[PDB]
From a paper:
Human prolyl‐hydroxylases 1‐3 (PHDs) are hypoxia‐sensing 2‐oxoglutarate (2OG) and FeII‐dependent oxygenases that regulate levels of the hypoxia‐inducible transcription factor α‐subunits (HIFα). The PHDs catalyse trans‐4‐prolyl hydroxylation of proline‐residues of the HIFα N‐ and C‐terminal oxygen degradation domains (NODD and CODD), reactions coupled to conversion of dioxygen and 2OG to succinate and carbon dioxide. Hydroxyproline formation promotes HIFα degradation through stabilisation of its interaction with the von Hippel‐Lindau (pVHL) protein‐E3 ligase complex resulting in HIFα ubiquitination and proteasomal proteolysis. PHD inhibition is a promising treatment of anaemia in chronic kidney disease by promotion of EPO‐mediated erythropoiesis and has potential to treat other ischaemia‐related disorders.
In the related compound IOX4, the morpholine ring of Molidustat is replaced with a tert‐butyl ester to enable brain penetration. Molidustat and IOX4 are potent inhibitors with reported half‐maximal inhibitory concentration (IC50) values of 7 and 3 nM, respectively, for isolated PHD2. The crystal form diffracted in the P21 space group with six PHD2181‐407 molecules in the asymmetric unit (ASU, chains A–F); PHD2 is principally monomeric in solution. Molidustat and IOX4, bind in a similar mode to the metal ion, that is, through bidentate chelation of their pyrimidine/pyridine N1 (2.15 Å/2.14 Å, trans to His374 NE2) and pyrazolone (2.27 Å/2.24 Å, trans to Asp315 OD1) nitrogens; the distance values reported here and subsequently are as observed in chain A of the PHD2‐Molidustat and PHD2‐IOX4 complex structures, respectively. Consistent with the established role of triazoles as carboxylate bioisosteres, those of Molidustat and IOX4 are located in a similar manner in the predominantly hydrophobic (except for Arg383 and Tyr329) 2OG C5 carboxylate binding pocket of PHD2. The triazoles do not make a H bond with Tyr‐303, instead π‐π stacking with this residue, which makes a H bond with the enolic form of the pyrazolone ring of Molidustat/IOX4. The structures imply that both Molidustat and IOX4 probably bind at the active site with their pyrazolone ring (at least) predominantly in its enol form, as supported by the likely presence of a H bond between the enol and the phenol of Tyr303 (2.63 Å/2.71 Å) and metal ligation via the imine (N2) pyrazolone nitrogen. The Molidustat/IOX4 triazoles are positioned to π‐π stack with Tyr303 (3.55 Å/3.63 Å) and are perpendicular relative to Tyr310 (3.49 Å/3.51 Å); this interaction is not observed with the PHD2‐Vadadustat and FG‐2216 complexes. The Molidustat and IOX4 morpholine and tert‐butyl ester carboxylate side chains, respectively, extend out of the active site. The interaction between the tert‐butyl ester carbonyl of IOX4 and Arg322 may in part reflect the observation that IOX4 displaces HIF1α‐NODD more efficiently than Molidustat, though the details of how this occurs are unclear and may involve correlated motions.
Residue numbers in the entry: 189 to 231, 253 to 406
Write the structure that this text describes.
């Protein structure tokens, strides 16, 4: 149940460490289905933003609705954030040509995004053999964390400067879906600069 998982794990883990992992998020059957839709969608990296209701993206929509379900039950308990929206789903295809991703902060200048959510959908992926490990350096901590892109794994972490992260090279094609949730106040201040946007 999303309620138990949100209050007994996600909320306390995020407030304590700012990095949270949920394994076996949707089950093998749904995971494979999402892989089929992602592969059929993508058949440097390739990026596509999915709203969830497009033809052939129905199970990606279920993934997004499941994430929303968890964040909903975290209402008002993730720090001081008021999460009132999110981006589309960044459905990314990462090439296995021995390329990694430089260390970066997702939201370094307050663009409204407060929580990064990544779902990994590569069945039987063995990071020990194929690479692609995510390395997060939580600010001010004496440790850093290597997160394997395990199949059906869901990852939460703060999007701001608290979590600089880099990705190690991979040697086989892989896919991940990222979604960012907004903070009401921050996202509002970021929208003021635009005429209409
Ligand atoms: C256009 C905007 C500004 C929204 O782009 C981002 O903010 C953004 C995009 C991508 C990533 N990350 N971070 C890790 C990975 N990655 C790579 C392989 N496996 N995971 C990855 O694509 N982070 C932030
Ligand atoms: Mn990132």
């Amino acid at each position: 149940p999303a309620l138990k998982l949100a209050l007994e794990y996600i909320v306390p883990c995020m407030n304590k460490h700012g990095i949270c992992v949920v394994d076996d998020f949707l089950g093998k059957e749904t995971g494979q289905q999402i892989g089929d839709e992602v592969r059929a969608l993508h058949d440097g990296d390739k990026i596509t933003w999915i709203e969830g209701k497009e033809p052939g993206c129905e199970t990606i929509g279920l993934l997004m609705s499941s994430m929303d379900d968890l964040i909903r039950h975290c209402n008002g308990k993730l720090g001081s954030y008021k999460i009132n929206g999110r981006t589309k789903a960044m459905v990314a295809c990462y090439p296995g040509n021995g390329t990694g991703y430089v260390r970066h902060v997702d939201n370094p200048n307050g663009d409204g995004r407060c929580v990064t959510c990544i779902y990994y959908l590569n069945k039987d992926w063995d990071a020990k053999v194929s690479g692609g490990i995510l390395r997060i350096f939580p600010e001010g901590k004496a440790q850093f964390a290597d997160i394997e892109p395990k199949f059906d794994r869901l990852l939460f972490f703060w999007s701001d400067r608290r979590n600089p992260h880099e990705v190690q090279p991979a040697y086989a094609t892989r896919y991940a879906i990222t979604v960012w949730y907004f903070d009401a106040d921050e996202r509002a201040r970021a929208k003021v600069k635009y005429l209409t946007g």
